[PDB]
Design an enzyme around this catalytic site. Structure first.
Site, mmCIF file in Angstrom:
data_model
loop_
_atom_site.group_PDB
_atom_site.id
_atom_site.type_symbol
_atom_site.label_atom_id
_atom_site.label_comp_id
_atom_site.label_asym_id
_atom_site.label_seq_id
_atom_site.Cartn_x
_atom_site.Cartn_y
_atom_site.Cartn_z
ATOM 1 N N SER A 1 81.337 -70.478 6.008
ATOM 2 C CA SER A 1 80.710 -70.193 4.720
ATOM 3 C C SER A 1 81.683 -69.570 3.736
ATOM 4 O O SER A 1 81.423 -69.611 2.528
ATOM 5 C CB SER A 1 79.511 -69.257 4.881
ATOM 6 N N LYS B 1 77.062 -58.702 6.676
ATOM 7 C CA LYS B 1 75.737 -58.301 7.125
ATOM 8 C C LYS B 1 75.740 -56.867 7.564
ATOM 9 O O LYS B 1 74.682 -56.234 7.551
ATOM 10 C CB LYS B 1 75.129 -59.148 8.240
#
Lengths: 310, 8, 310, 8
Positions: free
Chosen positions: A267, A45
């Site tokens: 993830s 991110k």
């Protein structure tokens, strides 16, 4: 060599590709994992936190002294926090009060102001509060699920890094989908800019298989499974939707640390579980499968990932 | 668990 | 571009230099921070964990199937843990039974076997148990405070990275000293290989100023202040020794996150505190000061670094 | 408090 970065936001990306050796034993394909935990605030991110701020500076949507606000209970908040600390913006983040204390401490260490909304109202409560705050004059909201600068930074950085480091040897790209910016930008770069044939696989939770047309549901694979199809997800550059169970994701993340020495989040286990399934198919014998591992295991000490180690 | 954009 | 790394140990280093902007406001020098948190298991020690294993493989001290053991209560254990997981060695780590559970969970996620030694015996008890275990046939002990491969990897990687990224503009190098390998190898590379004038400054805790000839003592700057002069510290390449208080180390690490968006550990604040004092001296006006920030802030959530944020 | 090589 690398340049001298004038602030920490400029240092995003340039993450390594690491070959997977034991989880792939017996395969004739090659699986390469891109280690996005090695970012200035330790997740993929960071790329879009920097790019969305830069893009708004360029367009005049964000000026010195203005206030940034975004609803996020995940890594995007950490990304925006370090960028606003590095570049000098006041930042407010909204999030349900269910967000862990550890993540709150990390955000506060960057001087982010947190607005905790009622847990009973979920993410929708956080979003509505941020939209209300963003309507104030002088406040800028990046909108991670709509902002084209999100997939664009992956066209400009993530995609080229994969292409250059593999020297054009990439036949499959597997990525978990949160905003979809990663898979959209990498796929657009490989298919549209390099005109390279690539089987692009989106990974989503079996418990919330919305891209595949199923109903949204609660799942434990933090960072993917938004429960809606984000605007930043480009279905036309994705060839396949693949589901992974919470248990498969957790167990494969544990095995990445144990069998490869790659400390990574839940993830990451989801993306790798999907990548390993694809990599075993006969049609990809001798081919190269690239996947993205979004962040680092230490961010998950309090989660189900480390449940088995006290 | 996460839904509605939670966790991202 | 970067190579495809055949396992995660090969991906050590290649860390960025980031210019410090607000902590340096008013100075006419330039302070660059090398972000060693962006390593495969997120600290500077990843370099010597890889290098000590590779070196023992090359010399034959370490063979497939052998057992690795080291006494370490810090980042060296994490470095050895991910390397041994990546390269396939059984690893045993000894440490006082008072090591935090968070660090023990990280070590066990790589499959390291932990032998806790009585807390009253401190590091001495862990060292004795490791030396006993290492004396068994088939067992290898890296010895982080004596192994020349420790400073050598900094001559081969850290030093050139600093030299090349700065395009030769480095006038001061400031480093906290734990084993001393970092400061020794970078100073050897700059002074001896590149024949370059550089003022080399070691930083140690005021509460344990042993390099300066003072008495050892207990301190909170994890990763430095070993309490003895390590064999891997070469005083002949160090030009100056500065001491830093626990409080100014902690405060400067908090200010690195808040004012620069750099999430880092306590010893990062120690190094930066000393670097900022040197950078303020008028004789370094216009000069470039480089310092090392050994690891990342998230590894310190349960420490004094985050006491002010509960 | 760290001493004797503790914490490294």
């Amino acid at each position: 060599h690398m340049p001298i970065f004038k602030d920490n936001s400029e240092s995003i990306g340039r993450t390594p590709l690491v070959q997977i050796n034991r989880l792939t034993a017996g395969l004739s394909s090659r699986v390469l994992a891109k280690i996005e935990g090695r970012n200035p605030a330790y997740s993929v991110k960071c790329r879009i936190g920097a790019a969305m701020i830069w893009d708004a500076e360029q367009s005049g949507k964000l000026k010195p002294g203005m206030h940034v606000v975004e609803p996020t209970s995940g890594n995007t908040g950490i990304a925006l926090a370090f960028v606003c600390a590095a570049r000098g913006y006041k930042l407010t983040l909204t999030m349900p009060e269910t967000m862990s204390i550890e993540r709150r401490m990390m955000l506060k260490s960057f001087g982010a102001d947190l607005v905790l909304t009622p847990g009973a109202d979920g993410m929708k409560g956080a979003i509505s509060k941020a939209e209300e705050l963003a309507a104030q004059p002088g406040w800028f909201i990046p909108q991670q699920f709509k902002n084209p600068a999100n997939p664009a930074i992956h066209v400009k950085t993530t995609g080229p890094e994969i292409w250059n480091d593999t020297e054009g040897q990439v036949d499959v790209f597997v990525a978990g989908v949160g905003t979809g910016g990663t898979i959209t930008g990498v796929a657009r770069f490989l298919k549209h800019e390099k005109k390279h044939p690539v089987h692009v696989v989106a990974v989503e939770p079996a418990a919330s298989p919305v891209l595949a047309g199923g109903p949204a549901g609660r799942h434990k694979i933090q960072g993917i499974g938004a429960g809606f199809v984000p605007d930043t997800f480009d279905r036309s550059v994705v060839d396949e939707i693949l589901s992974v169970t919470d248990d498969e994701a957790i167990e494969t993340a544990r095995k990445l640390a144990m069998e490869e020495g790659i400390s990574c989040g839940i993830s990451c286990g989801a993306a790798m579980a999907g990548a390993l399934k694809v990599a075993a198919r006969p049609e990809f014998a001798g081919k190269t499968i690239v996947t993205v591992l979004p962040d680092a295991g230490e961010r998950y000490l309090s989660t189900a990932l480390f449940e088995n180690l006290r | 668990g996460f839904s509605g954009g939670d966790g991202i």
